Design an enzyme around this catalytic site. Structure first.
Site, PDB file in Angstrom:
ATOM      1  N   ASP A   1       0.922  -1.142   0.000  1.00  0.00           N
ATOM      2  CA  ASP A   1       0.000   0.000   0.000  1.00  0.00           C
ATOM      3  C   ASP A   1       0.966   1.197   0.000  1.00  0.00           C
ATOM      4  O   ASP A   1       1.896   1.213   0.807  1.00  0.00           O
ATOM      5  CB  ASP A   1      -0.818  -0.019   1.309  1.00  0.00           C
TER       6      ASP A   1
ATOM      7  N   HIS B   1       5.834  13.366 -16.486  1.00  0.00           N
ATOM      8  CA  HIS B   1       6.640  14.558 -16.758  1.00  0.00           C
ATOM      9  C   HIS B   1       6.817  15.400 -15.470  1.00  0.00           C
ATOM     10  O   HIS B   1       5.867  15.575 -14.663  1.00  0.00           O
ATOM     11  CB  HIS B   1       6.063  15.398 -17.945  1.00  0.00           C
TER      12      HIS B   1
ATOM     13  N   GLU C   1       7.792  18.528 -21.280  1.00  0.00           N
ATOM     14  CA  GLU C   1       6.564  17.971 -21.859  1.00  0.00           C
ATOM     15  C   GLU C   1       5.637  19.119 -22.303  1.00  0.00           C
ATOM     16  O   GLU C   1       4.892  18.986 -23.297  1.00  0.00           O
ATOM     17  CB  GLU C   1       5.834  17.092 -20.802  1.00  0.00           C
TER      18      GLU C   1
ATOM     19  N   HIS D   1      -3.079  24.723 -15.475  1.00  0.00           N
ATOM     20  CA  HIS D   1      -2.060  25.644 -16.033  1.00  0.00           C
ATOM     21  C   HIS D   1      -2.090  27.069 -15.407  1.00  0.00           C
ATOM     22  O   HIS D   1      -1.653  28.052 -16.058  1.00  0.00           O
ATOM     23  CB  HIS D   1      -2.218  25.742 -17.560  1.00  0.00           C
TER      24      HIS D   1
ATOM     25  N   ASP E   1      -4.405   9.183  -3.425  1.00  0.00           N
ATOM     26  CA  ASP E   1      -4.131   7.936  -2.695  1.00  0.00           C
ATOM     27  C   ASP E   1      -4.464   6.697  -3.558  1.00  0.00           C
ATOM     28  O   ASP E   1      -3.632   5.794  -3.728  1.00  0.00           O
ATOM     29  CB  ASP E   1      -4.964   7.942  -1.391  1.00  0.00           C
TER      30      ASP E   1
ATOM     31  N   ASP F   1      -1.717   4.019  -5.190  1.00  0.00           N
ATOM     32  CA  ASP F   1      -1.841   2.587  -4.851  1.00  0.00           C
ATOM     33  C   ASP F   1      -2.030   1.723  -6.120  1.00  0.00           C
ATOM     34  O   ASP F   1      -1.503   0.605  -6.226  1.00  0.00           O
ATOM     35  CB  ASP F   1      -3.032   2.372  -3.895  1.00  0.00           C
TER      36      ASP F   1
HETATM   37  N1  LIG Z   1      -0.423  16.293 -20.976  1.00  0.00           N
HETATM   38  C1  LIG Z   1      -1.350  17.398 -20.575  1.00  0.00           C
HETATM   39  C2  LIG Z   1      -2.392  16.913 -19.562  1.00  0.00           C
HETATM   40  C3  LIG Z   1      -3.010  15.630 -19.938  1.00  0.00           C
HETATM   41  C4  LIG Z   1      -2.692  14.463 -19.235  1.00  0.00           C
HETATM   42  C5  LIG Z   1      -3.189  13.228 -19.640  1.00  0.00           C
HETATM   43  C6  LIG Z   1      -4.007  13.137 -20.741  1.00  0.00           C
HETATM   44  C7  LIG Z   1      -4.347  14.299 -21.463  1.00  0.00           C
HETATM   45  C8  LIG Z   1      -3.839  15.547 -21.048  1.00  0.00           C
HETATM   46  C9  LIG Z   1      -0.596  18.525 -19.940  1.00  0.00           C
HETATM   47  O1  LIG Z   1       0.638  18.422 -19.729  1.00  0.00           O
HETATM   48  O2  LIG Z   1      -1.300  19.505 -19.646  1.00  0.00           O
HETATM   49 CA   LIG Z   2      -2.388   4.162   0.097  1.00  0.00          CA
HETATM   50 ZN   LIG Z   3       0.689  17.219 -17.628  1.00  0.00          ZN
HETATM   51 ZN   LIG Z   4       0.094  20.720 -18.603  1.00  0.00          ZN
END
Ligand SMILES: N[C@@H](Cc1ccccc1)C(=O)O
Ligand SMILES: [Ca+2]
Ligand SMILES: [Zn+2]
Ligand SMILES: [Zn+2]
Length: 274
Positions: free
Chosen positions: A3, A85, A131, A244, A259, A263
Site C-alpha cells: 500500500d 513529466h 513535456e 495551467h 491515494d 496505490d
Molecule cells: N499532458 C497534458 C495533460 C493531460 C494528461 C493526460 C491526458 C491528457 C492531457 C498537460 O501536460 O497539460
Molecule cells: Ca495508500
Molecule cells: Zn501534464
Molecule cells: Zn500541462
C-alpha cells in the site's frame, strides 16, 4: 504489492512546492526550478540503490533534462517502464500538473527498495523534461533509444494529472493487458472507471509499437451530471479549476484520488513485472 503511504506522496508535493517558491514561482523548462526538481528526485533514488542517468538535450536554446532510474537486476530482455513529466508551465508550481504523477512514481520506486523486491522483469522509471513544450523530453528519449533496446520494452505506464480536486477516474484504453490490470484494482475498491478521452508522454512510445497504459483524473473539461452521480464532487465545474494556473498549488489536490491512483500504480507495476 504494498500500500503506498499517502503522507509520503504529499511530502514530495510539499518539497516541490517549496522548490517553486525558492525559484521564481515555477518549475518550467529552462528555469532553475526544473533542474532543482530533478536534483531532489535523483537524490532520493540514489540513496535507495538505483543506478541513475541524467539525459541532457537542448530545446529553444536552453538545456533540458530527463532523469532515468534503473533498478539493478531482472531479465535484460524484458523491461517494464513507468514515468511522469516533471516540468510545469511558467505560470505556477504545477502541483497537480504534474507533481501528482511525479510523486506517485517516485514513491513507488522507493517502495520497491523498502520491500526488498526482485522483479522477474528489469524495472526502469523516468521523469520527463519539457513535456509542456510538446512532449520534447519523451520524444528525445524514444528517438535516441536504439531499436535493439526498443524491442526489449515490455510496456510503458504513464501518470500525468492524478490528483484533480473534482475528480473523475479515467483509465487509458490502449494495451489490453495493462488496461485490465488497472481496471481490476479499481473493481476491488468498488470505484467505477471510464475510458480516457479528454497528448502526454506515452504517445512517442505508443507510436513505435511499445504497449502503453495509464491513469488520469481530468483537466479543463467540465464534469457532467452523470459523472457527479458516480464519483461525487460538483457537476458543471472543471475537473481541475486551476489547470495551467498560478493556483495549481498544494491546495489544488483531492487526497482520495491521489491515494487511490498511487496505490493503483504500485499494484500495476508489481503485477506486470513478475
Ligand atoms: N499532458 C497534458 C495533460 C493531460 C494528461 C493526460 C491526458 C491528457 C492531457 C498537460 O501536460 O497539460
Ligand atoms: Ca495508500
Ligand atoms: Zn501534464
Ligand atoms: Zn500541462
Amino acid at each position: 504489492a504494498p500500500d503506498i503511504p499517502l503522507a509520503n506522496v504529499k511530502a514530495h508535493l510539499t518539497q516541490l512546492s517549496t522548490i517553486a517558491a525558492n525559484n521564481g514561482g515555477n518549475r518550467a523548462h529552462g528555469r532553475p526550478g526544473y533542474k532543482a526538481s530533478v536534483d531532489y528526485v535523483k537524490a532520493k533514488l540514489d540513496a535507495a540503490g538505483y543506478t541513475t542517468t541524467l539525459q541532457q538535450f537542448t530545446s529553444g536554446g536552453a538545456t533540458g533534462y530527463n532523469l532515468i532510474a534503473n533498478w539493478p537486476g531482472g531479465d535484460p530482455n524484458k523491461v517494464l517502464m513507468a514515468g511522469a513529466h516533471l516540468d510545469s508551465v511558467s505560470s505556477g508550481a504545477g502541483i497537480n500538473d504534474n507533481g501528482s504523477g511525479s510523486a506517485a512514481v517516485l514513491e513507488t520506486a522507493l517502495a520497491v527498495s523498502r520491500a526488498g523486491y526482485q522483479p522477474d522483469k528489469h524495472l526502469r522509471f523516468a521523469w520527463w523534461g519539457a513535456e509542456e513544450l510538446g512532449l520534447i523530453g519523451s520524444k528525445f528519449y524514444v528517438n535516441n533509444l536504439p531499436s535493439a533496446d526498443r524491442s526489449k520494452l515490455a510496456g510503458y505506464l504513464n501518470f500525468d494529472m492524478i490528483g484533480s480536486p473534482n475528480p473523475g477516474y479515467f483509465v487509458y484504453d490502449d494495451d489490453p493487458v495493462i488496461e485490465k490490470t488497472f481496471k481490476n484494482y479499481f473493481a476491488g475498491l468498488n470505484v467505477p472507471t471510464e475510458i480516457e478521452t479528454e497528448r502526454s508522454d506515452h504517445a512517442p512510445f505508443k507510436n513505435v509499437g511499445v504497449p502503453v497504459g495509464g491513469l488520469f483524473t481530468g483537466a479543463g473539461y467540465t464534469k457532467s451530471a452523470a459523472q457527479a452521480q458516480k464519483w461525487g464532487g460538483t457537476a458543471g465545474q472543471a475537473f481541475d479549476r486551476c489547470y495551467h494556473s498560478s493556483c495549481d498549488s498544494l491546495s489544488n489536490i483531492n487526497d482520495t484520488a491521489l491515494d487511490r491512483n498511487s496505490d493503483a500504480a504500485a499494484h500495476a507495476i508489481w503485477t506486470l513485472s513478475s
